[PDB]
Ligand binder design. Structure first.
Ligand code: CLA
Ligand code: CLA
Ligand code: CLA
Ligand code: CLA
Ligand code: CLA
Ligand code: CLA
Ligand code: CLA
Ligand code: CLA
Ligand code: CLA
Ligand SMILES: CC1=C(C#C/C(C)=C/C=C/C(C)=C/C=C/C=C(C)/C=C/C=C(C)/C=C/[C@@]23O[C@]2(C)C[C@@H](O)CC3(C)C)C(C)(C)C[C@H](O)C1
Lengths: 163, 35, 165, 65, 163
């Protein structure tokens, strides 16, 4: 291959382990769509981690009010009942696979000028979001399993001006 | 890691050294007088 | 030859590459590769046992008071000499089995990975050279710091801030 | 030679008499595995013989539970 | 269409609402797959409902041990932690979409003789299994929301020799 969007400049074609050697064009499409979906999820999840520390919603997710719920991160999954999580998961999945909502003709915008460059920028931002989500999950799990394993506080560290 | 473990691993190292010395002698002498 | 990584490009303030036969250049490359490999191994072998002693995994009285990796010299001399002798015998085998100009090539060729593309091979050579270059300085830094301060690396870090835990 | 149903089921498992791989091959793996096995046997033998003492291991009749 | 497996005898072609009128073959295949999957799920689910009322394993599933603790009814969703349910769903979906495990060379030989008259039997058993849940579920939900709606006990009614 070696001729596809994704090469930036400092590294060029980044295939050190030879993953894309004995494959045809159909498998690289699956690789690319998986990369894009993981990156978009990470891009959403960085903000989804940052924002719930300044304000909350006015809901109640059943008996336990959604505002001032469990502590933001990994501890928040246990508070929500499993049936609601299954509901949200299946709604997400229906929207994803079936295409209900999301795919709106008003969505696909302009696309008049640069197209091969904006996608590359989106991919780079997504990769950075992937790495940020790792650390974030690493910090959350490490501090939740044992309090004070690393001598740091303020969950979203690095940004002390928030919490 | 007691003294017994340290001495055991040291004995393993010494045996490896002896075997290596023997093998080196055999290889060198065999290559010299090929035939 | 294959160095000059974009960070700083080619580096030779002393100009040793001017007055040098091609055989001398090949010898210099081989010496660099060997020193780099040994430096990487030594850095790892200082990092790991000190952490094992710090956690207390290897019982008490592992590396004496001030449990640095250099206490093995004065707590186990016979064993250190045996290790050095084994290494010397193995490298004597390497010397007597290899001709000049190929001293860095172990004829494995069937047990490793060795990526197919030649450009990837050159990139892997550069990566080996770079990690070896880093380890060469790291080893000397570790030796100097331990000899000056007489304390372990992680203990020094926890003593002088830097780290939080 | 009589042919049976079980014979036809198991026929593929006995069809490659004499097939080999040309010249050495996985022999170094065999040698390394044999060396490791020898080291393991020596360790357990010396533990049982009380020539190798390690912490929290007591070679005596145990109260168990 | 009107020529496909599914017709048995008592009624014949059951399409009163005329869903398949302006329909091609691909949507018919999709509908057939949907019916088969829903029916297989119901066939497994009826057994899954009936079995745990008498015997069960000693699984841990986190600190919430399943040894005679989690109820057999639909209330079991909230007893199990949500993350375990998510992992189970993801594994089942991987099997569903990528065919991990499942299809195998020892998968389904036989099939030498009766071929058309086995799929129809599977379909009919699945249809009656789907009618089962509706009542089993409806029964469980009605008896769970507030007991006393129906003058009975013992979830599965009609099998007094169980519990
Ligand atoms: C699950 C995550 C995921 C997936 C599926 C991919 C998949 C892919 N990446 Mg990728 N990547 C990822 C995470 C991921 N990456 C992360 C976290 C980083 C940051 C270190 C990168 C950085 C990266 C670069 C720099 C490049 C790729 C490239 C590629 C493509 C070819 C290389 C390959 O298949 O191996 C392939 C579509 C290459 C490409 O575009 O191929 C043409 C390429 O140049 N990726
Ligand atoms: C019922 C809901 C549902 C359904 C039906 C689908 C369906 C699909 N998704 Mg999907 N997805 C969903 C919810 C759903 N999604 C949610 C909620 C997220 C965000 C968390 C994603 C994120 C996502 C990504 C990033 C990708 C898909 C992809 C796909 C497609 C193929 C992969 C597949 O079937 O899974 C197969 C499942 C696996 C192989 C499992 C992988 C192992 C993981 C790591 C286990 C993680 C378990 C973890 C502990 C629990 C997570 C809880 C919490 C973090 C959410 C398929 C159309 C892929 C795609 O279209 O391109 C190929 C793809 O790249 N999805
Ligand atoms: C009209 C469609 C519909 C219907 C009838 C239900 C029905 C239900 N939902 Mg629900 N849900 C839906 C759509 C729907 N959902 C969508 C689109 C998102 C969610 C997200 C959601 C969450 C997050 C939760 C529910 C819960 C519930 C249950 C109790 C609600 C309560 O008292 O709080 C109930 C079975 C709750 C539950 O799990 O039941 C106890 C719960 O916590 N739902
Ligand atoms: C003894 C170790 C050693 C050796 C033999 C070499 C050898 C080489 N290096 Mg090299 N290098 C080393 C260590 C070494 N390097 C270290 C530690 C670094 C920093 C991490 C670098 C960074 C470096 C760069 C960036 C580049 C090279 C390049 C080269 C090649 C051309 C240079 C030349 O003309 O001769 C080199 C000189 C000699 C062979 C003679 C030995 C030098 C004197 C006699 C030793 C004095 C050391 C002195 C006491 C410093 C002490 C340091 C202190 C911390 C203790 C050559 C093969 C260049 C190359 O080929 O790329 C195209 C290049 O671009 N090297
Ligand atoms: C080149 C780098 C280097 C050097 C010089 C040393 C040196 C040493 N290490 Mg160390 N180490 C290293 C890298 C290195 N290490 C790395 C990379 C790690 C990370 C895994 C470690 C982790 C480590 C631990 C955890 C410990 C040591 C220990 C030791 C000391 C005793 C070790 C010993 O006897 O092993 C014996 C030597 C070997 C196992 C080498 C292999 C021998 C081969 C297999 C023999 C070949 C077979 C034979 C020749 C066959 C003969 C046939 C014939 C024909 C040839 C010694 C000072 C111990 C100590 O107390 O000191 C701190 C200790 O507990 N090391
Ligand atoms: C989710 C459930 C489900 C779904 C998707 C379908 C869907 C379908 N059924 Mg059906 N069916 C169902 C439940 C369902 N049924 C139940 C519960 C019964 C038993 C009462 C039947 C008994 C039934 C018969 C007897 C026949 C169909 C047939 C059909 C197909 C053609 C009729 C049409 O256009 O509509 C259609 C795709 C017909 C078929 O297979 O086409 C030849 C047909 O003859 N159905
Ligand atoms: C739709 C099918 C389905 C679903 C969603 C469940 C779901 C559940 N079963 Mg279950 N079960 C099923 C079919 C099913 N079962 C069948 C067909 C049998 C008979 C073989 C059983 C026998 C059974 C027992 C004996 C027990 C459960 C238990 C459980 C609960 C926790 C264990 C678990 O993750 O599943 C278990 C997963 C399976 C049994 C895998 C079935 C998948 C087939 C083989 C394909 C969970 C609510 C436990 C519980 O909480 O008891 C109250 C328990 O002890 N199940
Ligand atoms: C290597 C893969 C892997 C890893 C790291 C985990 C890790 C975990 N699983 Mg898990 N799981 C796996 C594979 C894996 N799973 C598979 C293949 C099926 C499941 C089904 C499963 C269930 C059903 C549950 C877990 C749970 C858990 C968590 C607690 C486990 C515990 O202490 O007991 C933990 C994060 C539990 C959980 O969510 O903890 C709250 C839980 O209920 N897992
Ligand atoms: C990662 C998870 C995953 C993925 C990717 C798939 C992938 C697929 N499934 Mg599938 N499935 C899964 C898990 C998964 N399955 C599990 C765990 C179950 C059993 C609970 C099923 C049961 C199932 C059936 C019965 C059918 C499929 C079908 C399909 C195919 C198209 C539909 C689709 O992608 O979703 C599309 C998703 C939707 C349209 C969502 C529908 C809305 C749901 C029904 C609302 C439910 C709300 C309720 C409150 C949640 C209950 C949670 C809990 C109590 C069970 C595709 C191959 C269908 C197929 O092959 O033919 C079309 C089909 O008929 N699956
Ligand atoms: C982990 C860590 C940290 C961190 C971090 C990092 C790096 C986090 C990651 C940050 C990063 C890299 C965040 C990128 C965001 C990109 C965005 C928001 C763009 C969205 C743009 C969107 C949603 C576009 C929307 C469009 O609608 C438009 C406008 C037109 C439409 O027609 C079409 C579409 C849909 C395209 C701390 C917390 C900082 C410190 C700590 O110490 C360590």
């Amino acid at each position: 291959f070696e001729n596809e969007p994704g090469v930036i400049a400092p590294t060029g074609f980044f295939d050190p382990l030879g993953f894309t050697d004995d494959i045809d064009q159909e498998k690289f499409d699956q690789y690319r769509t998986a990369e894009l979906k993981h990156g978009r999820v990470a891009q959403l999840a960085v903000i989804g981690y940052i924002v719930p520390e300044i304000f909350r919603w006015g809901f109640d997710i059943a008996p336990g009010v959604a505002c001032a719920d469990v502590p933001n991160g990994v501890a928040a999954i246990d508070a929500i009942p499993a049936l609601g999580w299954a509901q949200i998961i299946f709604a997400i999945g229906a929207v994803d696979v079936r295409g209900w909502f999301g795919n709106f003709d008003i969505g696909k915008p302009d696309l008049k000028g640069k197209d091969e460059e904006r996608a590359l920028q989106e991919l780079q931002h997504g990769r950075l979001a992937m790495l940020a989500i790792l650390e974030l999950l690493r910090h959350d799990s490490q501090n939740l399993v044992k309090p004070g394993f690393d001598g740091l506080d303020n969950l979203i560290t690095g940004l002390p001006f928030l919490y | 890691m007691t003294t017994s473990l340290a001495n055991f691993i040291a004995s393993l190292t010494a045996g490896a050294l002896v075997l290596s010395a023997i093998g080196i002698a055999l290889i060198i002498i065999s290559k010299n007088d090929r035939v | 030859l294959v160095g000059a990584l974009p960070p700083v490009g080619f580096f030779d303030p002393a100009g040793f590459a001017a007055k040098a036969s091609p055989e001398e250049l090949a010898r210099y490359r081989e010496v660099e590769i060997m020193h780099g490999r040994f430096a990487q191994m030594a850095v790892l072998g200082f990092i790991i046992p000190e952490k094992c002693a710090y956690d207390g995994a290897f019982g008490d009285d592992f590396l004496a008071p001030t449990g640095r990796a250099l206490e093995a010299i004065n707590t186990d001399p016979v064993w250190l000499a045996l290790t050095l002798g084994v290494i010397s015998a193995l490298e004597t085998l390497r010397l007597l089995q290899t001709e000049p100009g190929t001293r860095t090539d172990a004829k494995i060729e069937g047990l490793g990975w060795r990526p197919k593309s030649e450009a990837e091979f050159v990139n892997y050579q550069v990566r080996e050279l770079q990690q070896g270059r880093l380890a060469m300085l790291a080893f000397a830094g570790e030796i100097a710091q331990e000899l000056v301060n007489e304390k372990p690396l992680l203990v020094n870090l926890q003593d002088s801030g830097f780290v939080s835990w | 030679a009589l042919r049976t149903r079980l014979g036809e089921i198991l026929r593929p498992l006995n069809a490659e008499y004499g097939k080999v791989v040309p010249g050495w091959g996985t022999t170094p793996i065999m040698g390394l595995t044999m060396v490791l096995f020898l080291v393991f046997l020596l360790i357990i033998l010396q533990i049982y013989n009380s020539s190798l003492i390690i912490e929290n291991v007591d070679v005596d009749w145990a109260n168990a539970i």
